[PDB]
Design a protein around this ligand. Sequence first.
Ligand code: CA
Ligand code: CA
Ligand code: MN
Ligand code: MN
Lengths: 47, 47, 180, 180
Amino acid sequence: ETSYTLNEVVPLKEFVPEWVRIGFSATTGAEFAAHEVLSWYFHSELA
Amino acid sequence: TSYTLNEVVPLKEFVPEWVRIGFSATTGAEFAAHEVLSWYFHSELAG
Amino acid sequence: TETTSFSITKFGPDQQNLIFQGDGYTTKERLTLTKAVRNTVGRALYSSPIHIWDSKTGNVANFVTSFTFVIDAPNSYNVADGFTFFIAPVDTKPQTGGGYLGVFNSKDYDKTSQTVAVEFDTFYNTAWDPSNGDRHIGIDVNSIKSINTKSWALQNGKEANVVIAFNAATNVLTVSLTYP
Amino acid sequence: TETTSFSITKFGPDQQNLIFQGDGYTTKERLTLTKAVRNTVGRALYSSPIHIWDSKTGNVANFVTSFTFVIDAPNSYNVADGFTFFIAPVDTKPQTGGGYLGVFNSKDYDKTSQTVAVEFDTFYNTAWDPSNGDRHIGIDVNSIKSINTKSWALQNGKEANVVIAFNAATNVLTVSLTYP
Ligand SMILES: [Ca+2]
Ligand SMILES: [Ca+2]
Ligand SMILES: [Mn+2]
Ligand SMILES: [Mn+2]
């Protein structure tokens, strides 16, 4: 029940190549935490 | 006109846990063009 | 749980989610495995590895694939070699050409092959094919000698729709080809 | 039409359809990008390239991804740096660590980056982060300074559910994070 939503217009064709890879990254520096993913689902459709 | 074949094939006894799927075709002393016009794949593994 | 799915309705010139080997490539929005030229091999694989079974749990995957393909020959009599859908190790590379279909190296069972293929064979090779000489659909596991075969009448230049489905609970592999 | 789909509900120790970079690896049914350790970068990419837009027709894809993730820190005060879902060239490699989240190199706009990312930032870097010092969700296109951000209160060690959707008709990208 606690939610955070963000919406933005982002013309992807202007910024990214036609073929891409997708994924996750995380970092620590002088402070830290464990960053872990438990599950992942993805669906894309190009007409 | 259709042709159907069915067989029991214990796949665990023949292929690795991870595989790549695909198509191949060849010609020898005789020949033909071989072409694929569309392809759909779906696999599901319980865990 | 793991699932992988994809569809390609029309192939483009730069189809980067496929691995091309031999002279297979995309043109005129089709995937071309061989052109009608002597002595060639072409293969195309999906780029992602698929998890077919897991040793930790002993579970095996179900899958379904459907595709439309065309064999275009000079005439109905002088045609070779045929076409395969196959399942092989992640590092698979083309194997013997000609009647071996780019996927096997013997009619003798080679457990180090680890590949099973559904072939649509248009040329009769006496050493291992059904003696009645017909063109046929077969299921091959570790050898070019099919464990089972069904005769098929090729319709030169006509598109064929096939569905191949594996169900892990009964371990049955089903093949259907239809000419509409 | 082209579609690419996959789901991984439980990651296993040999997860061959992912590319691991830096110190990312799979363990305990989890994908771990980072352990709770100083100075690390970890990334994981899905193995197949995906076709996001086409220059021949001008069409761009619709997509949706969801995932659940955990950030587990020594305490609620000393937490850094964050986590990203990103979209980048096929040959993408880890970039600057720490505050740059392994995906960008500068706060200056650089069209050469060709990366858009959704970040979940836990440490306030004063040169580019929102001036109130809050942890936040942000959309980044070719720069670590977000084009828009939403404040988010971290619940340490709790799992969060995320949905990111892109609609090609309106070019809008929507991010939703939920804690139970
Ligand atoms: Ca033959
Ligand atoms: Ca930061
Ligand atoms: Mn045969
Ligand atoms: Mn930020």
